[PDB]
Design a protein around this nucleic acid. Structure first.
Ligand SMILES: [Zn+2]
Length: 384
RNA sequence: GUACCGAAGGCUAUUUUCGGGAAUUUACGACUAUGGAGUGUACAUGUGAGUAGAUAUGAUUGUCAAUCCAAAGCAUACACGAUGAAAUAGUAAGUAAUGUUCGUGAGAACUUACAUUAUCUCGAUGUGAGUCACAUUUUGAGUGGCAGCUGAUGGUCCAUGUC
DNA sequence: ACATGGACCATCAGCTCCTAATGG
DNA sequence: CCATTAGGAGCTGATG
């Protein structure tokens, strides 16, 4: 049972400069490996495998030119990890799993630094502070939410990140699973929609978190901040005052607003899944929703993006696999929103803008409720 | 002491706490020195436009025919503003006392006591001395009530502005 | 069509051994 | 000298 415990940390200035330098070197190494591979193909030679690119770097390039040996000044493990995940892009493009590599490009916050447990005595953790191989003891803001070494827990590896003025660490731990739950309640089903987040085939209704006053106020604030930030770029285009500081401040503010909205939405999804799973059903059937096609509709794109259907599905699948539940999903073209629950009529004149379902037998119910009931008693499905 | 901003890892708290605090009620966080006229709202007003976009909805061999359907911008209305808007460059966001130095300024550093989650603080239990020490302890905890499975690669969408 | 600078979407995986240097 | 802590090599054979 692989897990992760992502927590915010408290580096010092000397540790902050180390983190920044390591990330910069890793980005440079990724780009350099890509370019050298391109040049080799241009000539007509074979493919360098990354594990051999490192050997070429250590024994055939770095001695040759003494100009750039700052590479062996930052941790030698993060550099190797960056090279390997650069070669993973190529090995995924050779197979038809992905597209051609993409040249990380200077300046973002998506590149992290990787550390591993090398010796039998590092990566020791307490209620406060953790020991990371590149930096030493690093303080931890939240106490107890990282498996300590006092109570027989071991960290395999980890990653240090940086998002909007804050720093985080994410460590992965093998967890033993106990308390085998016995599921015996009647099964349920949930329909995912845009008027409400979810409607369950038992009566429970979860409203759209995006239709609340707080999120609307946040969106207004974000639009105002973006409009104010775009004036500084226009001003910068004219003069020669290239010492942008208010631009950095505005960028930080925009990133903070985005992060806050993400926090609200993620908390809502996690708590909703918690309540649904704690209700303890035997099985649940959901859908095979296609979000790309729905997002191709211009007037539905923003709402569908802000609803986060696929993330909810993945987290629900993880929790179901963890709690011993079974997840059922149906075909992409299963007639859920058109089939009556009494006679089985598959009426076709159902307009997309009707909130009430009415067929010939006289059955009348909400469209979402009818869809949830159709989902709960589905016959053909394949378990996720 | 309201809307907002900083901190207490995240969400929430009308009856959690410590600070700053308005262009003041679907309510443009506050000051500093230059800078001189704009900035904000229309989720409680029209046109762009049945237009872009989507259709496991029908007919002939890409059109026809039915069902849902934007946004930018322009135009209007209202609000605040020469008691100083945008932009540029900075300052602070635990409490008291004393006296210097530094900066144009908001302010900062060096001393004292308090408070506080100071690479730890607290609780509990046991032993010993006469309230203080030494050990063990996460099934103990970090303002209440609640939840946290991350990384890599690629793809696709979105917002703001100029022409 | 350029820049700005974000988010979510699908699918696939999560590091060991041996040597060689560092502080009193 | 010495428990610690760092570095170098490893596979994969492929229409940037
Ligand atoms: Zn019927």
């Amino acid at each position: 049972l692989l897990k992760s415990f992502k927590t915010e940390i408290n580096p010092s200035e000397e540790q902050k400069v180390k983190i920044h330098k390591t990330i910069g070197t890793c980005r440079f190494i990724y780009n350099f490996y890509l370019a050298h591979n391109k040049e080799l193909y241009d000539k007509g030679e074979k493919f360098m495998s990354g594990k051999s690119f490192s050997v070429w770097l250590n024994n055939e390039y770095l001695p040759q030119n003494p100009d750039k040996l700052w590479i062996k000044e930052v941790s030698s493990k993060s550099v190797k990890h960056s090279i390997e995940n650069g070669c993973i892009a190529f090995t995924r493009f050779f197979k038809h799993q992905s597209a051609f590599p993409n040249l990380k490009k200077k300046g973002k916050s998506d590149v992290k630094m990787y550390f591993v447990k090398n010796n039998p005595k590092d990566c020791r953790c307490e209620r406060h502070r953790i020991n990371i191989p590149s930096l030493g003891w690093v303080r931890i803001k939240e106490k107890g939410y990282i498996p300590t070494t006092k109570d027989g827990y071991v960290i395999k590896s980890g990653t240090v990140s940086m998002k909007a003025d804050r720093y985080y660490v994410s460590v992965l731990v093998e967890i033993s699973n106990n308390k085998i739950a016995n599921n015996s309640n009647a099964g349920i089903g949930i329909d995912l929609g845009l008027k409400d987040f979810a409607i369950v085939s038992n009566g429970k209704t979860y409203k759209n978190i995006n239709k609340s006053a707080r999120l609307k106020k946040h969106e207004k604030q974000l639009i105002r901040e973006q409009r104010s930030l775009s004036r500084k770029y226009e001003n910068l285009k004219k003069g020669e005052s290239t010492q942008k500081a208010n631009i950095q401040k505005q960028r930080l503010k925009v990133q903070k607003l985005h992060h806050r909205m993400d926090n609200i939405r993620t908390d809502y999804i996690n708590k909703t899944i918690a309540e649904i799973v704690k209700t303890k059903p035997s099985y649940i059937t959901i859908e095979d929703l296609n979000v790309k096609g729905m997002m191709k509709n211009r007037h539905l794109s923003k709402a569908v993006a802000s609803q986060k259907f696929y993330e909810f599905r993945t987290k629900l699948q993880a929790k179901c696999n963890e709690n011993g539940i079974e997840l059922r999903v149906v075909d992409r073209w299963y007639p859920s929103s058109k089939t009556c629950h009494c006679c089985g009529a598959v009426k076709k004149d159902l307009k997309l803008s009707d909130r009430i379902f009415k067929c010939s037998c006289g059955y009348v119910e909400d469209r979402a409720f009818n869809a949830a009931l159709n989902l709960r008693d589905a016959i053909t499905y394949e378990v996720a």
